[PDB]
Amino acid sequence: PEEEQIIKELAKRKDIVDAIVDSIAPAIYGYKEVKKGIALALFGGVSRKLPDGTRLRGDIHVLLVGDPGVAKSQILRYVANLAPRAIYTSXXXXXXXXXXXXXXXXXXXXXXXXXXXGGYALIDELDKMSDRDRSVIHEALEQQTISISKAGITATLNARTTVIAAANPKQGRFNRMKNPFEQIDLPPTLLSRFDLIFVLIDEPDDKIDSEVARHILRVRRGESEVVAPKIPHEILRKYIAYARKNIHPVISEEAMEEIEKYYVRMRKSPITARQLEALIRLSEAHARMRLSPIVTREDAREAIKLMEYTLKQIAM
Amino acid sequence: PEEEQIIKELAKRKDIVDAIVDSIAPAIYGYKEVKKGIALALFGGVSRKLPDGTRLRGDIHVLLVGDPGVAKSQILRYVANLAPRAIYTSXXXXXXXXXXXXXXXXXXXXXXXXXXXGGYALIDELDKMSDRDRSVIHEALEQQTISISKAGITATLNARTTVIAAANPKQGRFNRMKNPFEQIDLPPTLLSRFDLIFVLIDEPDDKIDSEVARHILRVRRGESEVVAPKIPHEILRKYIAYARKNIHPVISEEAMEEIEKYYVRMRKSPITARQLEALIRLSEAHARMRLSPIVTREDAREAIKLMEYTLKQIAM
Amino acid sequence: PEEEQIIKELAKRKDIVDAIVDSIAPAIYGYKEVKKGIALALFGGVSRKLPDGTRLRGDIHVLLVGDPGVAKSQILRYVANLAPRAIYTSXXXXXXXXXXXXXXXXXXXXXXXXXXXGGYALIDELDKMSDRDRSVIHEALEQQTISISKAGITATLNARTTVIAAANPKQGRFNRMKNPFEQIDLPPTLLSRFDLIFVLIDEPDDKIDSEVARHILRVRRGESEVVAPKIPHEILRKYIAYARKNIHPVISEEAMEEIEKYYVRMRKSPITARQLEALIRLSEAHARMRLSPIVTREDAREAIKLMEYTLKQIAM
Amino acid sequence: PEEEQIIKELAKRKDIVDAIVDSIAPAIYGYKEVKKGIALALFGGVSRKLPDGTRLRGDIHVLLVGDPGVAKSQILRYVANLAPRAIYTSXXXXXXXXXXXXXXXXXXXXXXXXXXXGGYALIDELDKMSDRDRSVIHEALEQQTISISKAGITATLNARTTVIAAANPKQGRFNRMKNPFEQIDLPPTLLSRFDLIFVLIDEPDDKIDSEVARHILRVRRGESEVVAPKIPHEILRKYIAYARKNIHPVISEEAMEEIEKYYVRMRKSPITARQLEALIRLSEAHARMRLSPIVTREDAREAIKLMEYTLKQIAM
Ligand SMILES: Nc1ncnc2c1ncn2[C@@H]1O[C@H](COP(=O)(O)OP(=O)(O)O)[C@@H](O)[C@H]1O
Ligand SMILES: Nc1ncnc2c1ncn2[C@@H]1O[C@H](COP(=O)(O)OP(=O)(O)O)[C@@H](O)[C@H]1O
Ligand SMILES: Nc1ncnc2c1ncn2[C@@H]1O[C@H](COP(=O)(O)OP(=O)(O)O)[C@@H](O)[C@H]1O
Ligand SMILES: Nc1ncnc2c1ncn2[C@@H]1O[C@H](COP(=O)(O)OP(=O)(O)O)[C@@H](O)[C@H]1O
Ligand SMILES: [Mg+2]
Ligand SMILES: [Mg+2]
Ligand SMILES: [Mg+2]
Ligand SMILES: [Mg+2]
Numbered sequence A, B, C, D: 001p002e003e004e005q006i007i008k009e010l011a012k013r014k015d016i017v018d019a020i021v022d023s024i025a026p027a028i029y030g031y032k033e034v035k036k037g038i039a040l041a042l043f044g045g046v047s048r049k050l051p052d053g054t055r056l057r058g059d060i061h062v063l064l065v066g067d068p069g070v071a072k073s074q075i076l077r078y079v080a081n082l083a084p085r086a087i088y089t090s091x092x093x094x095x096x097x098x099x100x101x102x103x104x105x106x107x108x109x110x111x112x113x114x115x116x117x118g119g120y121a122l123i124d125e126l127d128k129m130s131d132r133d134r135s136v137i138h139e140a141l142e143q144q145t146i147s148i149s150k151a152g153i154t155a156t157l158n159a160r161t162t163v164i165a166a167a168n169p170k171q172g173r174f175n176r177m178k179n180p181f182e183q184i185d186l187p188p189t190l191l192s193r194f195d196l197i198f199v200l201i202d203e204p205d206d207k208i209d210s211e212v213a214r215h216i217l218r219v220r221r222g223e224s225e226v227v228a229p230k231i232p233h234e235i236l237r238k239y240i241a242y243a244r245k246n247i248h249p250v251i252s253e254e255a256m257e258e259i260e261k262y263y264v265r266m267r268k269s270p271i272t273a274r275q276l277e278a279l280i281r282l283s284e285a286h287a288r289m290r291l292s293p294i295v296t297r298e299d300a301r302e303a304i305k306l307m308e309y310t311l312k313q314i315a316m
Helices: A002-012 A016-021 A032-043 A072-080 A131-142 A206-218 A233-246 A253-267 A274-288 A297-315 B002-012 B016-021 B032-043 B072-080 B131-142 B206-218 B233-246 B253-267 B274-288 B297-315 C002-012 C016-021 C032-043 C072-080 C131-142 C206-218 C233-246 C253-267 C274-288 C297-315 D002-012 D016-021 D032-043 D072-080 D131-142 D206-218 D233-246 D253-267 D274-288 D297-315
Strands: A062-066 A121-123 A163-167 A196-200 B062-066 B121-123 B163-167 B196-200 C062-066 C121-123 C163-167 C196-200 D062-066 D121-123 D163-167 D196-200
Touching: A002 A016, A002 A233, A016 A032, A032 A062, A032 A072, A032 A163, A032 A196, A032 A233, A032 A274, A032 A297, A062 A072, A072 A121, A072 A163, A131 A163, A196 A297, A253 A274, A253 A297, A253 B206, A274 A297, A274 B206, B002 B016, B002 B233, B016 B032, B032 B062, B032 B072, B032 B163, B032 B196, B032 B233, B032 B274, B032 B297, B062 B072, B072 B121, B072 B163, B131 B163, B196 B297, B253 B274, B253 B297, B274 B297, C002 C016, C002 C233, C016 C032, C032 C062, C032 C072, C032 C163, C032 C196, C032 C233, C032 C274, C032 C297, C062 C072, C072 C121, C072 C163, C131 C163, C196 C297, C253 C274, C253 C297, C253 D206, C274 C297, C274 D206, D002 D016, D002 D233, D016 D032, D032 D062, D032 D072, D032 D163, D032 D196, D032 D233, D032 D274, D032 D297, D062 D072, D072 D121, D072 D163, D131 D163, D196 D297, D253 D274, D253 D297, D274 D297
Parallel strands: A062 A163, A062 A196, A121 A163, B062 B163, B062 B196, B121 B163, C062 C163, C062 C196, C121 C163, D062 D163, D062 D196, D121 D163
Antiparallel strands: none
């Protein structure tokens, strides 16, 4: 509770929104959106069921697909080292690290890739999952409920976790013209489950490279650099678990008008009505991220920003 | 019986017909007919056998086929949460929810998709039923009697339930010109079993979209909104089970003339004499829906209205 | 309804109770109790479930075990020719007769011996059932619910029928001193399921034999004799199906005292608290048999009479 | 919250403790302890984990083993109709009733007997579980965590439910001298998992029988009697779910002295140090049952009472 005191203070801050991303991964340089994306993903949408409106997921899934050597693997890793109930697990070898452990997890489930059925499961190399390990997630993302009835017994595991995953193209790189979506090795009906897909191509370019490298070296020498979180990870991890508890943003007519005015815009053009749902989740989380609990015109605004970005990137 | 008192009063109401639909699914916006359709389906036709006129089904089956993201899945779900003996079960995973349970069902049968052989079985994704799970229904809709003689034993299960199902095109979407009936993945001799098929395409259009979205948000925030039943679901569920008991509408010469005058109209034009039978069921149920028990010119009138609609929608 | 008129009149009759038995099997001579037993069995106990008092079977099962040539086979047969939904099926050969058929049965199930899962299944030669065909009944009598999950599928059939069965001793005859219950080839935990077991030994004796024979010949010559029902079987079959509908006897404090005063008596002495339950079923049915719907001191009285008889017969 | 108001008031009541049991099963007559036992079991022990003191189960398991016709089956059933997340499932046939359903359960798991991995699983006939269905529970009671790794995948289901089960002797009845514990068909290392085992033998005796019967009849006639809960089940079910939320009894030095003073007593004599743990759970729950949250000398007192009873019954 001495902590709750601090948190409120942080939120008070003017730039909190920005500070929170600059703390996701201080190491990796850039990727403001892929950071502000994961950021929301870690705060999640409202997720509050009603009887009349049955179930109501709020968890925000995020896919990271790109050419090799773009920091995907790296990034996920940094998230594990931050996110509370984080499970990193790359399609390669057996068993995984991630966790900072404390007598195991608070509630149910576990498995092969290693998912806690809550908790965010950072799945690197989702395109190299043995069709089995894939299937499960596919169900988990789709249904929101896994199930194993191998034997006379029938086991229905309740899936309630967030998935921040990475993935490479079926080819490795995809710079070609063809759509980034034919190049991924995942069944489209799975991809459609992510609320945001960051496509990461990598032209050469001097400027950026110079920056990126100079940056690596910097935060690569000794055991310290002026390149560490803008917010302590222990604080920021409490701050998260906190907002995913006491805050449940309600949509301001203010915002409402902004998101619909857009969904319709978005419609004019592989869009469905789902795009609207996920957009809602982002803007809800963007509020929770700062504790509101009112998705103001700004929140909703920001949400669409990030989304029209994920989108632009698809044109490559 | 303190209840029966209320019911009669409701029926007394001038707009009951309308109130009853605005209570099917207050959530989903629009689809007056797909609502007033399901409405009848929940009240069913006369269904009263005679020795001379052998068997006499009255149950009204309803199929909902459309492009994705049109509320099919959603809708069925809301029906389960209303309909008395409702069983929702979407072709995906194992076991299903629906029921509000009370020491199981009043009479016989059960199975794989999960049907109670009475009770309405809301079958979402009927186009993704394993050829086995399909077969059964096919028989159930066709015969009105299932059967399993796997072993020396022979089991003939009496099928007496209503089927309100959904389904997607073999392609996913079907906006093309080709007939909506070549695009469905169900054997025509099954489809022919539905008394009403609502074809749901989805052009974009601003107006409607704006409405739909604005609506979602509305009844999507907090745990309450001015968007709940025009009639309490507990009352309306008793009202149903009641009319499917004490009311057995007889056809008024009044109406008779209206439905035949039409069937013949309908004939001029993939129509049979079955179309006449089902039309009869609707108009009978539309009365029962308000308790008559006389299919007045209005009832019969309404019936054909809904039917010439289901029809218009086929031209797409 | 022109029928309902007659029925009420019959009940009005002073001797109805007696008339009803003299109509079970006019052929077979004697066995007043085995007749008045089956009689009750055909009318069944209350059988009305409550939420607080969960399930509530009322069906009365009856076992007939005796030396050969005592009319068991015969009797069951006559019952099939009377009882509404009757299924006769003797452990021998394949398929069975019984039914008077009419487009099959009103509700679910069917099988190997041939049972309709309602309807009374007259099972002759229950001691010669292939351990399989036995098992089922055993479950059916015990659970009140059968089940076949042979394959990936799981089938739980609701068992709701009456069982009036016959059976011979493991030896054929049992005149010996040893208890009639060690001589039957059925698992005691099955036998315990019957509400009445009529043990039929057959000493020679002139008097009785003379009667029995003289009787056979009588109702054995030509195609007619003064030995036909005291009540038309078509009437009496409606009368049954009627009382198993409109009558649901409630226990009069009057009777209550009689049955408990006895159960306790019965206790002093292979008795349990189940004996009390079944006794309750008889007395309830004995009322329904005449339509009450109040288990008067007489009904309850009669019930124990029949029961202390089934009992005396066990001493042989 | 209008409810929370009532609850507090009930607790205020002087006799609440007693009222709460007289509401478990008003039907079945007697068994004050088997009622006050189940009562505690429904309120559970503290169950609050710490890092230093690792895991900390609080759920109270209860076994009911006795001769047939003692109300075991019946009782469990009444509990299902009360307990919030209750699952009744008797080793017989397939699928089970219990639940009052509401879009399925709040959290994870499901299976063969049918358990929700929280919620109390009322398992009647635990001695007739197919060695498979047993195993699971055995693990569930022992580990507190189930697991299915059938295939490449590995599924660890978190077991966090209460088990109120019944069971018959390997012989059926056991009146003999031999210890009730050799007569049960369960592996001793399973039985040791129950916090209370009620052994139910059934001598005849007139007095009691007269009572029992008279009672049955009473609450067996019509659809009503002065034999219904001393507390409404809807209230009492909220009251439970409430105390299993806001109350977490701490042990008063007051009580502490009472339970240890006894454990040691208990030691003098198949006792371990586990007996102490479970005793602690009862007394904790007995407080929670009335909301304390301080296990006063009385609570602890009561706990040992019930326990020295379960014990006396073992001498038979
Ligand atoms: N934008 C970036 N910022 C910082 N480091 C980067 C960046 N892009 C690539 N790197 C470097 O690449 C390495 C990680 O490559 P990696 O993420 O594992 O490729 P992939 O995502 O395809 O598995 C790191 O050691 C890091 O120094
Ligand atoms: N007409 C509508 N009214 C209200 N919501 C709608 C409507 N159409 C689509 N939706 C939205 O779409 C979502 C449901 O899509 P869904 O019914 O599952 O597609 P499908 O029927 O193909 O499975 C809901 O969350 C809902 O908000
Ligand atoms: N009490 C009886 N009344 C009339 N006929 C009887 C009687 N007992 C035996 N019978 C005669 O026995 C024959 C039937 O024997 P049955 O019932 O088949 O022996 P079981 O019961 O062991 O199969 C009938 O033809 C009938 O004439
Ligand atoms: N103590 C009792 N109080 C009330 N009814 C009882 C009692 N004991 C036995 N019964 C009767 O026994 C029947 C239930 O027997 P049951 O519980 O199913 O035996 P078991 O527990 O071995 O399965 C009920 O219908 C009930 O009337
Ligand atoms: Mg990589
Ligand atoms: Mg769908
Ligand atoms: Mg024979
Ligand atoms: Mg039992």
